[PDB]
Amino acid sequence: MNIFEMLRIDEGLRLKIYKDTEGYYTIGIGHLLTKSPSLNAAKSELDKAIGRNTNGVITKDEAEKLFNQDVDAAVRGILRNAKLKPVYDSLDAVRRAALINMVFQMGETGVAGFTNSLRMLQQKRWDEAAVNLAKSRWYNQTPNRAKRVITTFRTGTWDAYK
Template sequence: MKSKIIPLLCQEEGTELTPYHDSLGYPTVGTGFKIGPAGVPLNNYTFSLTQPVNDVWLQSLVDETMAKMLADEEITEALQHCNQPRCDILTSMAYQMGVAGLTGFHKMLEAICDEDWEEAVTQMLDSNWAEQTPERAERHAEVMESGQWAPTYDFE
């Protein structure tokens, strides 16, 4: 099965070619590209992206995120127990929180290594991440538990 990380991130992050404030108040552009510290006025950012530039930037950030994930032993071990949808969910989490944020989910990663999907979901949803983005966390948890995109996402 081919990775769906790009359509997943486009759906979860949305794509705005002009700067906007994300849900936590960070200036952001494109497909969730944080471009400054929280609370900075948007009039400090006097540019917009084209879709082709956004697409290249997104792929570059995904590639960088995946390389950092594979450099972490605990994440790499967990990925070996995941099918493609579950790998994409972990990549999406790392894209959103940073790889350092994903490494904080020790109990979730341990549950994944044990292929205890219910416990992995419990650990995902018992987090600050799930409190900050509850709908995304619920969607990601559904895929982590089932190992299937549908019916949660419609790009299978």
Template sequence: MSQIIPLLNFEEGYREKPYIDTEGYPTVACGIRIGPKGASLNNYTFTVPRDVGDAWLESFVKTTIIKMNTNPSIVAAMKSCNPARRDILISMAYQMGVSG
């Protein structure tokens, strides 16, 4: 069973209230960018409960997996991995992009 959502939440951390990430972008939940670089947090007056953030993240992960499945080399690597290693490959693609 995949543990990708808990893994990404662990790697990224989770904050219900918007914050500025290390690159200067307004961000919320488990590292989801919500605005342009340098935007004021005053523009974002909401919170994202954990279950909503997990659903949002799951949607992004599904899109990442679809992109991964278009690359034969990645498909071959995924097939040879156990579930934990597959989750790590998905995490890497999610965080760095499928092209790396």
């Protein structure tokens, strides 16, 4: 297991524009296109992202390309963020993947706001961090995915993904 396989499990793969769990136009492996209710706007973003006129459909290779860019972006977002970087640096590689997963789903600014959870993770108070992480809109709206990510933080194992 690794961050790519983990997020593939959590995000799936769809080659046509779909709406994500928040109702936002998305494609591939959880690649958010726009929060606009306009499908045409989403199609424009998609064509820009891929570099051709797609008409809302991409190939698996193209989906995996966006995915690699998006994982890369999540990591660089963490490293450039003054709140997230020290937490990330303090973690083992498995728990680092859990943090990347959160940033992929909610964005750097969103995760950086989990101030008390981040402190508990930095303190390596794993059970406490897990309890705090679940007191969130995140957990309530996507509980099965949040449970997997939280288990990964609690245990430092890949148990929730096998």
